[PDB]
Amino acid sequence: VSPACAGRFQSPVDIRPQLAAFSPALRPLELLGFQLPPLPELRLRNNGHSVQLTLPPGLEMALGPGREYRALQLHLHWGAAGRPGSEHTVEGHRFPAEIHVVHLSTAFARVDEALGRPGGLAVLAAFLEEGPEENSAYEQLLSRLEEIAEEGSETQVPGLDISALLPSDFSRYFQYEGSLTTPPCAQGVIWTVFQQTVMLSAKQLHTLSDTLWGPGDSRLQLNFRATQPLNGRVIEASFP
Amino acid sequence: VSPACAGRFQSPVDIRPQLAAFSPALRPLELLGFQLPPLPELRLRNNGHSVQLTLPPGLEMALGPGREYRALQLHLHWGAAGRPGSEHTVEGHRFPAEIHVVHLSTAFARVDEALGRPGGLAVLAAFLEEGPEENSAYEQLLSRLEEIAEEGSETQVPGLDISALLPSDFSRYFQYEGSLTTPPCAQGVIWTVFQQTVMLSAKQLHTLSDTLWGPGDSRLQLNFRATQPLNGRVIEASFP
Ligand SMILES: *CCS(=O)(=O)c1c(F)c(F)c(S(N)(=O)=O)c(F)c1N[C@H]1CC/C=C/CCCCCCC1
Ligand SMILES: *CCS(=O)(=O)c1c(F)c(F)c(S(N)(=O)=O)c(F)c1N[C@H]1CC/C=C\CCCCCCC1
Ligand SMILES: [Zn+2]
Ligand SMILES: [Zn+2]
C-alpha cells in the first residue's frame, strides 16, 4: 500500500454546501484548445479501474489569473444497474457517474515533479445524471466501449470537443484541496466540482456501467473510492 | 534585465480592502517554534540592499491544513529622513517600513526547486509604523545595526522571539500570489500581509533608515520596489 493513501487530506469528500465558504475570488474557469480537430486521433483505454482518454498537448485550463494548467487525460467513475457510482457526494447523495479531467501545473514539466506539491495537479469534476436525450459528445466515447471491453485494451477515437463532456456553466463550482483517489493518493490536488451536472441517456449510463470488464473476470463497475473526512478543511464555493 | 521582473503577476501591489475578497476559509496563521533561545546566535548581515537575519531550522508555519512552511530568513524595507519605505501600500498609503519573513514549503527540499512554483515560497509581511513607545523586539535588531554599517559586513546576534516582531492578531490578513520584489522576481510566491501594524519609536525608525550603507558610498535607504499591477488577481481577506 502507498502511505499517502492514509494522509489526513484525502479525496473524494461529501460536499455539504451549507458548510461551504463563499469566496468571490473564485472566478469562472477558462479553457483553451479543448475543441480538437478529428485528427490526430486520441487513445481510449480500459485500464482495469476506469476508462481513460489520453489528451494531446495544447489543452490549457486556468483556475484564475496566473493559475495555469495543461490537461493530461480524463476518466470516469460509475456504479451499476440501479446503483450510483460518483466519487464525490452532495449532502450524502451519490450521483450516477462522474467525469474527471486531470491537469498538470505549467510550472512542472512532468507529473512526478508535481505529485504532493501544492497546486501541482488540478482535477475538474462533474457529475453525470440521466436526461432525456442522447449526449452526442459522450456517444463518441460510449459507442466504442465494446471495442475495449477487455481489461488492458484500447482503441483510437477521433478528436472531439472535450469541453462538451463538461457542463456549460463554468461559473458555479466548489473547490477544495485533496488527493488523487487512486494510488499513490498524493495530496496537494486542487479539486473543482461543478454545480451544474451533465446529462446522459439511460441507455448511455447502462453502456458505461455494463460494458467493461476489470481484473479477474469481474465487471468493471462501482469504481469509486469511499468518501473521505474533510478533517477541518473548508470547501469553498464560487457562489453564496 | 531579469526578464522575470516584467512578468504579469509581480509584487508588491496596492491593497484596497474594499476590493478584497473575504473567504472564511482563510484561518488564523499558525507559527510554531518561533520562540528562539539566546543560543545558538544568528547571523545578521548587511547585504547591500537590506539587513537580513538568517533563521535556524524548526520555525514551522501553516497557511492552512497541510499547507506548511519553514522560515528561512527575515529582512526589512525602509525609507529615509521623513519618507516612508514599505513595499506594499494600502489605498495609496506607504508605511514607514515593512518586515518580510520568507519561508520554504515543506513540499520542496530546496529553495531552487521552489522558485517559480506556485506556493513554493511564502512570505509574511507586516507594516511598521511610528508609535510613542520603544519596541523591545525590534531594539534587539536595531541596537546591533551600527556594527554592520558597511556593505557586506555581518555579526552574530542572540536568538529572540521572531514572532514578537509580528502584529497582534494572526486572524486578520490579506493574501495574494505574486513575486519576489528583488531579482530574480520569481512568481508563485504567496504573500500574506497582516492587517494590523507594529509600532516603533521615531528614534528606532531613524536608527533603521540612517545606520546602513549601500553600494558605492550611498546610504542604504528606500530599498523598496514600485507597486505592480494586479492584472486580474483578486486580493483575499480573512475577515469581513
Ligand atoms: C488508475 C489510473 S486512472 O484511471 O487513469 C486514474 C484514476 F482511476 C483516478 F481515479 C484518478 S483521480 N480520480 O483523478 O485521482 C486519476 F488521476 C487517474 N489517472 C492519473 C494517473 C495516476 C497518477 C500517477 C501519474 C502517472 C500517469 C500520468 C497521468 C495522470 C492521471
Ligand atoms: C537581495 C537579497 S535580500 O535582501 O535578503 C532579499 C530582498 F531584498 C527582498 F526584497 C526579498 S523579497 N521582498 O522577499 O522578495 C527577499 F526574499 C530577499 N531574500 C534573499 C534570500 C531569501 C531566501 C530564499 C529566496 C531565494 C530567492 C533568491 C533571492 C535571494 C533573496
Ligand atoms: Zn478520478
Ligand atoms: Zn522583502
Author numbering:
A (entry chain B), B (entry chain A): 19 to 50, 50A, 51 to 54, 54A, 54B, 55 to 72, 76 to 82, 84 to 125, ...
Give sentences from the paper.
We applied the TCI strategy to human carbonic anhydrases (CA), metalloenzymes that catalyze reversible CO2 hydration by producing acid proton and bicarbonate anion. Catalytic domains of CA isozymes are highly homologous and bear structurally very similar beta-fold. In this work, we investigated fluorinated benzenesulfonamide compounds bearing sulfonylethyl ester and sulfonylethyl carbamate moieties as possible covalent CA inhibitors. We showed that sulfonylethyl ester/carbamate behaves as a prodrug by reacting with His64 in the active site of CAs through the elimination mechanism to release ester or carbamate moieties, thus forming a reactive vinylsulfone group.
The cyclooctyl or cyclododecyl rings present in covalent compounds 20–24 and in non-covalent compounds 10–11 have been previously designed by our group to specifically bind to CAIX isozyme and intended not to bind to the other eleven human catalytically active CA isozymes. The crystal structures of compounds 21, 20, and 23 with CAI, CAII, and CAIX, respectively, showed covalent bond formation between the ligands and the histidine residue of the enzymes. The distance between the nitrogen atom of histidine and the vinyl carbon atom of the compounds was around 1.5 Å, consistent with the length of the covalent bond, and was visible with strong electron density in all three crystal structures. The tail moiety of the ligands is also coordinated by two hydrogen bonds – with Asn 62 and Gln 92 (CAII numbering) in the cases of CAII and CAIX, while in CAI, a possible hydrogen bond is formed with Gln 92 and His 64. Despite the apparent selectivity of compound 23 to CAIX compared to CAI, compound 22 is more promising as a drug candidate due to its slower covalent bond formation rate and lower associated off-target toxic effects. * CA IX mutant C174S, N346Q, prepared in yeast as described in Leitans et al., 2015.
